[model samples]
Target: SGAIYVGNYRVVNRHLATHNDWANLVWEDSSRDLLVSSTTAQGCDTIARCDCQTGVYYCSSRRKHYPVSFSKPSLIFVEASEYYPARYQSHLMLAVGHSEPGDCGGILRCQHGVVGIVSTGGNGLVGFADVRDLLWLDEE
Candidate 1:
């Protein structure tokens, strides 16, 4: 339940891992009603949505129960691979950025980026710890 607010969205830690060549961030709507899924480096297919209205959300595909309760879902952070094919070969990634939303948050529709919501341009890369040494700010 580690939650933080950056800009207009409520962010939380979901303990998820980003695939190679990709970083991650979590996001909720302005009203904090629903949580949007994220993008991985390989391709956008993962989906974990939350319904704050009922205080429950399930797997979009199987409708299976997801144990995590997301009031402010945290963006899963993972270190990208160190070699070739680890980084995306397509367009220049923002390192940390998001894009305007047109479709549902169920799918990643933004350009390549890391450590921020893909559908909306809000970076939640701040330190999740309280220690002074654990703090950080996005340089890019």
Candidate 2:
């Protein structure tokens, strides 16, 4: 029975250590529903989702253009127990960067997979986040 039991790890926090924008998405296509949580560096952020299985939202920033600083991205999901050594359950990550000329809002898909999502910041590192099927987990 011990082997049949596993841990549950799912948590999201608005970690605004610096001035920036953050977006997190977690959904299940089987239910035709999703949740999109986003927040600016400030406390006045918003959270909502789409009516369909897919949706998109964008955030705008009005900051003085400087230089890009590539660095590591944030992480969302986690795998409590993985039988396969190569399997790594991950969450979603959103990254924004000042394009080549240091223009803001230049969005890029850093990483999107079962292993979680990744995005790049001005520092060009990477952020990792998790994605979980809520309906499935709820039934259990």
Candidate 3:
């Protein structure tokens, strides 16, 4: 333990998980630090293929919220099944339509790995911190 204690009693936890084994095809679209990988690639086909094709739920607190979510590439919300499309994409940042119960520090994940963290929000959008880039600068 860091012997650290800080912040509120509640936290917003959203996840994008899969039981698939990790694949080595991981790469970064450095401009936006969006992590990309595929279990299969067609050379010219646009969609990404990954073994992490499914998900589930859990929240460590008493408050109820959506734990299992279908994360999307678009800034808007998806109703039934959420997915991470493997097509090439450019997301300078995301603009979340509404604020979460916990404003920041929430982990945004994909394929059971860290993708981004909730950075900031308001006026119809929230920005995320690219974990890859964040640590890239930190490995010093």
Candidate 4:
């Protein structure tokens, strides 16, 4: 897995998403009971969800896994990336501006909930990978 110990958590280097993409996300030696999933892009549904069943962490208050869905807001993707089906500057993207070097793992989120994790950077925007199919992936 892509992870390295740092001040408070581990920084996983990202793979090249597209022409100009970067990977990002950070977790700790200990579980925080949370993770980033998907971010809403323009023209996409205002509502989406991520199944957190794979984490398998029992709720501190509850006894077992529970049913849950995720939420995110849509952004007006100003520039369309023509990387062609590669998902680098994914069909869904944001105009949040370039990410600094230290912004490798800062999870993108919204009032609704967790968006995608920061992945692609450059241009006057940012590209993030949807955590839905990934973290929501079946246990390894």
Q: What TM-score would every model get versus the actual structure?
A: 0.17, 0.20, 0.31, 0.33
Q: For every candidate structure, what is the RMSD over all alpha carbons to the true structure, in angstroms? A: 16.9, 15.1, 15.3, 15.2
* Candidate 2 lDDT by residue in tens digits, 1-140: 00000122122222211122122432222111112233322331112211121222122333332222222222333222121122232333433432121221222221221222222123432232323333232222
Q: Which stretches of candidate 4 lie over 4 Å from their true place?
A: 1-92, 135-140
Q: What tens digits encode model 3's per-residue C-alpha lDDT throughout 44-98?
A: 1111122231222111132322333333433343222122332222332354333
Q: Which of candidates 2 and 3 reaches a greater TM-score? A: 3
Residue-level lDDT tens digits of model 1 in 1-140: 21223222233322222242123344323222233233322332222222121122122333332222121333433223211122221111122222222211222211221122222212421111111111132111
Error of 4 at 33 (Å): 22
- List clashing residue pairs in candidate 4: 14-23, 22-119, 25-105, 37-131, 38-115, 38-116, 39-116
Candidate 1: segments with Cα more than 4 A from true spot: 1-54, 65-67, 71-76, 79-140
Ranking by TM-score: 4, 3, 2, 1
Backbone clashes in each candidate structure, one number apiece? Answer: 4, 29, 6, 7
Q: Which ten residues in a row have the lowest lDDT in candidate 4?
A: 27-36
Model 4 TM: 0.33
lDDT (0 to 1) per candidate: 0.23, 0.24, 0.31, 0.31
Comparing 1 and 2 on TM-score, the stronger one: 2
Q: Give the TM-score of candidate 2.
A: 0.20
Candidate 2 clash total? 29
After aligning candidate 1 to the native by TM-score, how far in Å is the CA of 137 from where it should be? 27
